[PDB]
């Protein structure tokens, strides 16, 4: 299963020019396009090697649509101020995300569409892709406008159509990179903090995709007390990192085991010191 | 591909 996402962000700046607009395009775990409103190019810029195969006609259409998005979301902010009766000299953030998920067959699986204003949900498309969910009364005014127009089936036509149709093209063009999984590299360290207490930190590096499960077990029993786990973090080269640490008494390190589960590993590895 | 977008 693979997915594609599109994220947009509009940040208002009173007196500092037009609001900053940043839009990015994401495959399941790989960014491939970008657009910055303050950049000199003012064009949809590629951020992946395989996406450069697209012809100039592709970039002309993509640039025109995203630039239309910035103007639409700039006009959107002024409407949001009067809808909520806010100060015209204040700064706010407008967010948006929607994409499509495909299956092993390349079949349509799920569709999403959500807007957000100042970190809270504003309007969202339901799972049926033909009805809306207004979070507050202000969004119901927009919902009424988006119900007078048949916006539901246009996004549904895109989500089941152009989104999926273009996603298979993106995967096929760069199957050498996106469709393959890099297995994690696993090792363990040792860090004593006193004469009878030590910290065992299980390391997993260079995996793709980023979804991975690390479980520290003691004598076959999972442990959460005295365990520190950090969120998955990107390496910048297309891989991700994650470690889990546990403080153990000295002389009992051989009892503890580390288990790492990942898609790239056919069998979940077991690591013991 | 980038989708269409509508105002409020």
């Amino acid at each position, epitope marked *: 299963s693979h997915s594609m996402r599109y994220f947009s962000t509009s940040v208002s700046r009173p007196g500092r020019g037009e609001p900053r607009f940043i839009a990015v395009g994401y495959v399941d775990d790989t960014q491939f396009v970008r657009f910055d409103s303050d950049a000199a190019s003012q064009r949809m810029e590629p951020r992946a090697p395989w996406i450069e195969q697209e012809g100039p006609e592709y970039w002309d259409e993509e640039t*025109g649509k995203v630039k239309a998005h910035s103007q639409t979301d700039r006009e959107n902010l002024r409407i949001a101020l009067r809808y909520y009766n806010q100060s015209e000299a204040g700064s706010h953030t407008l967010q948006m995300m929607f994409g499509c998920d495909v299956g092993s067959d390349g079949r349509f699986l799920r569709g999403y569409h959500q807007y957000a204003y100042d970190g809270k949900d504003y309007i969202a498309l339901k799972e049926d892709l033909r009805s809306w969910t207004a979070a507050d009364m202000a969004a119901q005014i927009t919902k009424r*406008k988006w119900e007078a127009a*048949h916006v539901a*089936e*246009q996004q549904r036509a895109y989500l089941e*159509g*152009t989104c999926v149709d273009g996603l298979r093209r993106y995967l096929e063009n760069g199957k050498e990179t996106l469709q393959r999984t890099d297995p994690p590299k696993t090792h363990m360290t040792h860090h004593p903090i006193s004469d009878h207490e030590a910290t065992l930190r299980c390391w997993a590096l260079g995996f793709y995709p980023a979804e991975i499960t690390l479980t520290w077990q003691r004598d076959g029993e999972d442990q959460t007390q005295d365990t520190e786990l950090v969120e998955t973090r990107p390496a910048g080269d297309g891989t991700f990192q994650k470690w889990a640490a546990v403080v153990v008494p000295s002389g009992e390190e051989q009892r503890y085991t580390c288990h790492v589960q990942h898609e790239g590993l056919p069998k979940p590895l077991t690591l013991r010191w | *591909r980038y*989708p269409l977008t*509508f105002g409020w």
Partner: T-cell receptor, first 113, second 114 residues
Framework: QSVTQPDIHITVSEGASLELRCNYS??????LFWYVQSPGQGLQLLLK??????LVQGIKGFEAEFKRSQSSFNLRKPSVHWSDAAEYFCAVGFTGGGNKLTFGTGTQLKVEL | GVSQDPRHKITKRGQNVTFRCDPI?????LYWYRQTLGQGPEFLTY????????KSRLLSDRFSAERPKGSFSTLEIQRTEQGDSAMYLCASSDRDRVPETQYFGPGTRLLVLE
């Protein structure tokens, strides 16, 4: 892309059934339009469909039916008038590739009495 | 409902021409098309109320289109050649109607002569 109008020229007698076809590229759910253009002035919108409802009634007695299984949006008129002699274009909007319209090859129609 | 100006224009090759379009009120989008003699219209460029979003990459930089105040649009073509003789169409839409209907004006037919 690749909007195709098979009927490139039709000349019929007044009062006969009329059908002008229009096809798209087998995979889109696009905006559909039909425009008429007299030799002098510009285009006048007749019908539009994206909507939901297969069969659409437009101006000047023209009606169109959408068949997704066939990917066809064919103009129809029960009885053609003598004044309908003009070029008929069907316009499509491929929503994925922008909201610009992709016009057809054009059908030149004449009606004799 | 869209109004254009002028309807017919005759100019010599290698000079400057300029056309103006007055679309419907409260419509925020404007499309430019070029229709040759007895052929389908060709897309040129389109705006959303403030700026040029997309241009037909085939048409060179000498084709200048602008919608400064978001109400009327101007099209300027420099170094005219006989291959540019065609009808130029102006269309406007709402961007808030899902069918996204574009309404065209009477158009401007251009004749370029040596």
């Amino acid at each position: 892309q690749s909007v195709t109008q098979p009927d490139i020229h039709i000349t019929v007698s007044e009062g006969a059934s009329l059908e002008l076809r229009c096809n798209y590229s087998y995979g889109a759910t696009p905006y559909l339009f039909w425009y008429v253009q007299s030799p002098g002035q510009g285009l006048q919108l007749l019908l539009k469909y994206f909507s939901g409802d297969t069969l659409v009634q437009g101006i000047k007695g023209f009606e169109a039916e959408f068949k997704r299984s066939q990917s066809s949006f064919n103009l129809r008129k029960p009885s053609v008038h003598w004044s309908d002699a003009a070029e008929y274009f069907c316009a499509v909007g491929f929503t994925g590739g922008g909201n610009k319209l992709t016009f057809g090859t054009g059908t030149q129609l004449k009606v004799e009495l | 409902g869209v109004s254009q100006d002028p309807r017919h224009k005759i100019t010599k090759r290698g000079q400057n021409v300029t056309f103006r379009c007055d679309p419907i009120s409260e419509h925020n989008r404007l499309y430019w098309y070029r229709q040759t003699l007895g052929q389908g219209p060709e897309f040129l460029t389109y705006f959303q109320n403030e700026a040029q979003l997309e241009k037909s990459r085939l048409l060179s930089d000498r084709f200048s289109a602008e919608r400064p105040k978001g109400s009327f649009s101007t099209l300027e073509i420099q170094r005219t050649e006989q291959g540019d003789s065609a009808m130029y169409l102006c269309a406007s839409s709402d961007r808030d109607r899902v069918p996204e209907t574009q309404y065209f004006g009477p158009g401007t037919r251009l004749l370029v002569l040596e």
